[PDB]
Amino acid sequence: DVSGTVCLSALPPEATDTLNLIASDGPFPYSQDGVVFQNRESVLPTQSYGYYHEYTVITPGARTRGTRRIITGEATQEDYYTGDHFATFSLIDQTC
């Protein structure tokens, strides 16, 4: 399940950078950005394979990709943030 909706302005500023890169089709900082997200644990709504894609949200200071990601869905404005490496998700509201 999705935990609720969160305004983009309440998320780390790096999430706004990742959404702007998705809008321009990159270029992205990591080679893993844009891969399909399988939703293997069924935390998000069930959809066909390829409906969801994963993008990194950079964690300042980290050596690795860290635990923050945006998952896009194919629907308009459907983007989910996770800050705990896919354990929980919130829908992003880009209007606020």
User: Which residues are the active-site residues?
Assistant: 54, 85
Beta partners for 55? 70
- Give the other-Cβ count within 10 Å of 92's Cβ: 24
